[PDB]
């Protein structure tokens, strides 16, 4: 069947700060595993992914898309300044994911290196259940050897290369201060299990294998997170915890179930469990393009199994789909397989129409594992003939690598999420394909509506005629039509052609030139000839009638809305408040969690540039937000003026 077994398999990524030595964990996390978007690799007769995570967390999609991908995790602090602002929004989301983890505190052997502390952050910040299985003996320069406090065993480190490591048992001067971090140990594990309650509080016998019994029963219910410590770079308590990974850490069948709906009903619970009885399932995670084996699909089957020299459903794109070869990317080298079994993590040579975020099943099944509009948006001018061209290139691939953005090429126009996400694709553009070109300041896509009713007639002498009656829609309703045309007074065959001829002008925009959203409309009657009338010349009705709305249903210019959430201490409300209320902004509920104060906001996107130099500016360094587009509000009269009067 397989090599490794599901129980074997352990799914995992590494969430730290280089400043926390990311880069120096990694490295020696392949190096010994050994014998990148995910590399296979074992340790101990187990199979284990590492999993590439996104350089950076105010990656909302991709850093979602990865969670649901690893079933584990491992953390990195640093021993000196403990937990910190960036992986403190990332220990929350995965908390919402119910990824179980367990911390390793790294670089104890530098200046400044506190481990009591760092294990207090956890706990002080994050409101997290979390004990050290292990204690350091010493620090800084004097870090030597580690405790381990389940087996009650000791390992001294003579080396910077991780050889030769002598076990010995612990000094008494250590004895008493482990007995207690032991019993302390104990205790924060047992809240969640009650038979393990009696053992302690009748002071019964605690066995090793039972204690790891009960640990792990607590971490991969996300109600502990173990504590462990070591230096990267000098190769200690690295194999500690890699061996901690397998006792502790989740297999895939040691976790709750992917969930998505169905391809025919939108909204249905499907339950893709491990297994190799049921249908195929799978997601694509990433996509990249090698010069050799050409383009790269990397992906992880949920369900059932696979086979190269097959078929497979994209159901994404509802398309049928050939399996090439397939690849597994170890530490130092390729290989190259023909089944990959649920649980696993594999990469597919010569797709044609997946992309990231695509979802693949089997034949006779349906279901659909993931599921955005452009706020803001850039003009980027090329130097000359040479780059324009490839550029134009670029462009074509990359929706294939990330599908959140857009291109207009009436000189290019891109738009997205936020000036984040286009502040990528641009520095990807410019290194990765090489193109010299000016970009110029970030702008938000404005939109325009209807605050009334007509009903309204355009007519084309050629000729075509139509009356139609328009009414505003309810705000993020969209667009819709219908045909109430009876006898035929409009032709059928010309009646598309009108709802074609509709959005291409609402498209342009009748106020300050933005797209026209939310409007209905109805065509109630018309009339024709037969050597005049076109598809042609009714178009120009369309057009005509929603101008002629336009000087009556009273239209307005929409701007997006975001959803801010703050996290600061309560001292400073009077500031934030302050803040925000000069931003055009408005406070919506709140709550506090820990010390500090939970503020929960709407602001207008337009408002809220150059944000975080005035929060770390206003908290020091102390506050945190996150940000989403919500909904499409009205702009004030005299801003609104301004942008009319701004575009001629």
């Given at each position: 069947?397989?090599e490794f077994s599901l129980e074997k398999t352990r799914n995992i990524g590494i969430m ?304 049928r789909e050939r399996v090439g070869r397939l690849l597994q990317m170890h530490a130092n ?316």
């Open positions: 069947a397989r730290a700060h280089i400043d926390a030595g990311k880069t120096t964990t990694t490295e020696r996390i392949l190096y010994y595993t050994g014998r990148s978007a995910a590399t296979t690799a074992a340790w101990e007769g187990h199979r284990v992914n590492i999993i590439d995570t996104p350089g950076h967390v105010d990656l909302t999609v991709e850093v979602e898309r990865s969670l649901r991908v690893l079933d584990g995790a491992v953390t990195v602090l640093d021993a000196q300044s403990g937990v910190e602002p960036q992986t403190e929004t990332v220990w929350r989301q995965a908390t919402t994911y119910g990824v179980p983890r367990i911390v390793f505190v790294n670089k104890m052997d530098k200046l400044g290196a506190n481990f009591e502390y760092s294990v207090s952050t956890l706990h002080d910040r994050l409101q997290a259940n979390a004990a050290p299985i292990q204690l350091p003996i010493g620090a800084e320069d004097e870090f030597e050897a580690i405790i381990d406090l389940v087996e009650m065993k000791c390992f001294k480190y003579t080396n910077d290369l991780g050889t030769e490591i002598e076990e010995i048992e612990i000094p008494e001067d250590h004895l008493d201060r482990a007995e207690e971090a032991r019993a302390s140990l104990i205790e924060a594990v047992a809240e969640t299990s009650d038979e393990l309650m009696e053992k302690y509080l009748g002071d019964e016998e605690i066995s090793v294998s039972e204690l790891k019994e009960a640990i792990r029963q607590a971490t991969t219910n996300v109600e502990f997170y173990p504590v462990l410590c070591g230096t990267a770079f000098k190769n200690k308590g690295v194999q500690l915890m890699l061996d901690a990974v397998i006792d502790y850490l989740p297999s895939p069948l040691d976790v709750k179930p992917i969930i998505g709906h169905r391809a025919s009903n939108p909204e249905e619970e499907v339950i893709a469990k491990a297994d190799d009885s049921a249908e195929f399932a799978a997601l694509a995670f990433k996509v990249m393009t090698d010069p050799y084996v050409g383009k790269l699909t990397f992906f992880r089957v949920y369900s059932g199994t696979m086979t190269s020299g097959s078929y497979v459903k994209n159901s994404t794109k509802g398309k080298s390729r290989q190259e397989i023909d089944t990959v079994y649920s649980g696993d993590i594999a990469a597919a040579v010569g797709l044609k129409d997946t992309g990231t975020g695509d979802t693949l099943c089997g034949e006779k099944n349906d279901i659909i594992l993931e599921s955005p509009e452009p706020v803001i948006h850039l003009s980027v001018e090329p130097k000359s003939k040479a780059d324009q061209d490839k550029m134009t290139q670029a462009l074509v691939k990359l929706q294939e690598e990330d599908p959140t953005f857009h291109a207009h090429t009436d000189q290019v126009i891109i738009g997205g999420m936020g000036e984040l996400h286009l502040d990528i694709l641009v520095d990807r553009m410019k290194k990765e394909f090489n193109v010299e070109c000016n970009v110029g300041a970030p702008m938000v896509s404005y939109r325009e509506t209807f605050k009334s009713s007509a009903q309204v007639q355009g007519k084309f002498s050629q000729y075509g005629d139509v009356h139609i009656e328009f009414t505003p829609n309810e705000t993020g309703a969209g667009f819709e039509f219908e045909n109430a045309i009876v006898g035929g007074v409009v032709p059928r065959e010309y009646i598309p052609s009108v709802e074609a001829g509709l959005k291409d002008a609402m498209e342009n925009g009748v106020l300050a030139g933005y797209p026209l959203i939310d409007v209905k409309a109805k065509l109630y009657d018309g009339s024709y000839h037969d050597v005049d009338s076109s598809e042609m010349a009714f178009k120009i009705a369309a057009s005509l009638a929603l101008k002629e709305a336009a000087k009556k249903c009273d239209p307005v210019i929409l701007e997006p809305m975001m959803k801010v959430t703050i996290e600061m201490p309560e001292e400073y409300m009077g500031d934030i408040m302050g803040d925000v209320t000069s931003r055009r902004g408005r406070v919506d509920g709140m709550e506090p969690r820990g010390n500090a104060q939970v503020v929960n906001a709407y602001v207008p996107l337009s408002e809220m540039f150059g944000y975080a130099t005035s929060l770390r500016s206003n908290t020091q360094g102390r506050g945190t937000y996150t940000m989403y587009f919500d909904h499409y509000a009205e702009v004030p009269k005299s801003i609104a003026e301004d942008i009319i009067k701004k575009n001629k």
